[PDB]
Ligand binder design. Structure first.
Ligand SMILES: OC[C@H]1O[C@@H](O[C@H]2[C@H](O)[C@H](O)[C@H](O[C@H]3[C@H](O)[C@H](O)[C@H](O[C@H]4[C@H](O)[C@H](O)[C@H](O[C@H]5[C@H](O)[C@H](O)[C@H](O)O[C@@H]5CO)O[C@@H]4CO)O[C@@H]3CO)O[C@@H]2CO)[C@@H](O)[C@@H](O)[C@@H]1O
Ligand SMILES: OC[C@H]1O[C@@H](O[C@H]2[C@H](O)[C@H](O)[C@H](O)O[C@@H]2CO)[C@@H](O)[C@@H](O)[C@@H]1O
Length: 563
């Protein structure tokens, strides 16, 4: 209990970040206090709350959180955080309406003593921010912002840094954002993760790693990127003898390391563990819930491959139902909630629960993965909520970087997923050893420039059918969407798309290859798009439903407008 206090409860000072701010912007309160508590991360020991009210009756109860300031520096090849001042408490709020808000602070500690502040008034003006990310009410396959604009996630996993810490995100995130990226995913566990909150303990959270997460969230704010926060990863509950990067013997949950659990199976039902997990969810909501740049709360990375001694489907299901209900109830902004599985088809008993707002697929597969992605996307339409292919790679034991240095595998996956009805791109692994050093960001820029001017929420897209190839001496296949105004095609050569040795294609041809006939009514405008250079190649006005295919090396995109 390094942070314990044993003084009578009193507010000593309050700092306010600004009295005028924009819609959805951060309003931060710093609270200096003394009190009686053993653990500032436990609301039964000390409970800080900010009570906000707008002009329209809406009240918000925002939990406060323990905070330490740091100053970062680079010590050769590793980040070092120097503490600045004593720790204190913060409240982080974001206004959804404009106009006036009144608020005050309430604090209660374990003695039952309660103190409060006077009421303060702030004023909120309109801003450029689109709001929080929600499921689209127009098309349940897709996400939107509160203001109605679509959110199509384009990006990759960027789940932890090297020893350089936040200084790696200083490099990766601007490169991603300038190439059309608006999404990434970070890990808040296991204990070795850059942003691990449960580093030494499951009862107290790591203030340095939480500060790094602040920093990276602030960088995403500046770059208009949106983050999935993955709270826990399967390794935490997987025994050393089971392989696959296990970590149970080292995890703070284990009694050997000071935690409440004698075995990982007890995670789902141990009363002490459940209480501390809820405290962690409260801490996460308190410290990060304000942010519209939090796209989603994700409970688990691949919960199905925890130890088989620990995976009890009914208990994992009930835990997800209960925690999703608790998290939603304490989150004033009601962020999206999800979870993930390593098994590519997922677990319908869990994917079907209403408290998970969208489903995911992880798939690592080397052979015919285009067909596998299409099949999984078609299959999971049964859930009637968005589908994110949250992890994708070859099944090559991490050897994607030597097998495919040009990123053709990533290329194939992002085009296939977006044009098959998934909510956004397939999200690659290997951000640090592959995407960045091989400079693969251009693939995302080409795709983003192709899709960004289409409102997917309103096209009523469905997977392409009713088509007829007429192509000789070549095997061309199609992934496509047919909408009320647009038809989007990705054509690929089946004999070239899975070969990765050749250099990046340089500029297709002037020649006719073949044709594809579509069940559509002319006239139409046809745009041919180079998926590697990310540019229009050719435009063609047509009076019939037979679309010529120009010569191309590996793959080609076509945008068709119904006139
Ligand atoms: O440096 C930080 C940290 O790294 C840790 O190791 C990392 C490792 O470097 C990779 O980045 C790896 O990436 C995998 C992620 O876990 C991801 O969620 C996903 O998960 C894998 C899973 O790890 C595992 O490989 C699993 O294996 C399958 C296997 O493919 C086959 O199906 C077999 O029959 O079953 C097992 C499952 O029982 O496959 C999952 C995907 O299906 O895939 C990513 C790529 O592999 O993450 C590691 C951490 O999880 C440690 O070295 C740590 O010490 C170090 O500090
Ligand atoms: O920050 C990510 C890693 O960057 C590395 O530097 C790269 C740099 O980003 C760029 O790609 C340049 O062309 O090559 C450098 C490596 O040769 C390293 O600084 C590494 O430590 C970082 O983790």
């Amino acid at each position: 209990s390094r942070y314990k206090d044993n003084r009578p409860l009193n507010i000593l000072g309050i700092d306010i970040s600004k009295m005028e701010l924009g819609r959805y912007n951060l309003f931060e309160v710093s609270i200096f206090l003394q009190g009686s508590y053993l653990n500032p991360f436990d609301p039964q020991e000390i409970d800080v709350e900010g009570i906000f009210e707008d002009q329209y009756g809406n009240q918000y109860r925002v939990p406060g959180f323990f905070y330490q300031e740091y100053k970062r520096e680079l010590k050769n090849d590793y980040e070092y955080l120097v503490p600045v001042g004593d720790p204190y408490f913060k409240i982080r709020f974001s206004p959804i309406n404009i106009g006036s808000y009144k608020f005050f602070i309430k604090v209660k500690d374990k003695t039952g003593r309660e103190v409060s502040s006077d009421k303060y008034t702030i004023y909120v003006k309109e801003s450029e921010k689109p709001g929080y990310i929600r499921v689209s009410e127009k098309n349940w396959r897709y996400f939107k912002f509160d203001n109605g604009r679509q959110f199509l996630p384009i990006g990759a996993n960027i789940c932890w840094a090297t020893s350089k810490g936040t200084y790696d995100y200083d490099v990766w995130l601007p490169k991603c954002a300038e190439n059309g990226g608006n999404y990434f995913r970070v890990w808040l566990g296991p204990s070795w993760a850059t942003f691990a909150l449960e580093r030494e303990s499951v009862k107290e959270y790591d203030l340095k790693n939480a500060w790094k997460l602040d920093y990276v969230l602030n960088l995403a704010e500046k770059l208009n990127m949106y983050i999935m926060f993955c709270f826990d990863s399967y390794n935490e509950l997987r025994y050393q003898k089971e392989g696959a990067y296990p970590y149970w013997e080292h995890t703070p949950h284990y009694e050997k390391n000071g935690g409440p659990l004698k075995e990982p199976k007890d995670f789902w039902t141990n009363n002490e563990m459940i209480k501390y997990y809820k405290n962690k969810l409260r801490y996460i909501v308190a410290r990060y819930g304000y942010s519209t740049n939090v796209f989603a709360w994700e409970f688990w990375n691949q919960v199905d491959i925890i130890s088989p001694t620990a995976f009890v489907i009914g208990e994992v299901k009930k835990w997800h139902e209960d925690m999703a209900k608790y998290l939603n109830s304490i989150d004033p902004w009601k962020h999206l909630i999800t979870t993930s599985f390593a098994f590519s088809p997922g677990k319908p008993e869990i994917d079907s629960i209403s408290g998970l707002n969208f489903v995911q697929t992880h798939i690592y597969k080397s052979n015919r993965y285009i067909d596998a992605l299409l099949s999984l996307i078609a299959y999971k339409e049964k859930y009637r909520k968005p589908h994110l292919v949250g992890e994708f790679g070859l099944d090559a034991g991490g050897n994607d970087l030597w097998v495919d240095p040009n990123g053709y595998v990533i290329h194939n996956a992002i085009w296939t997923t977006i044009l098959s009805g998934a909510s956004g791109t397939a999200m690659s692994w290997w951000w640090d050893n592959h995407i960045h050093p091989n400079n693969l960001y251009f693939h995302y820029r080409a795709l983003a420039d192709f899709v960004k001017d289409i409102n997917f929420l309103e096209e009523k897209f469905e997977r392409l059918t009713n088509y007829k190839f007429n192509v000789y001496n070549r095997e061309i296949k199609v992934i496509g969407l047919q909408g009320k105004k647009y038809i989007l095609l990705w054509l690929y050569n089946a004999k070239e798309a899975y070969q990765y040795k050749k250099d990046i294609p340089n500029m297709d041809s002037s020649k006719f290859l073949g044709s594809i006939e579509l069940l559509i009514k002319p006239p139409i405008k046809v745009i041919y798009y180079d998926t590697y250079r990310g540019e229009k190649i050719k435009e063609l006005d047509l009076d019939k439903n037979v679309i010529p295919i120009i010569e191309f090396e590996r793959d080609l995109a076509i945008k068709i407008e119904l006139l």
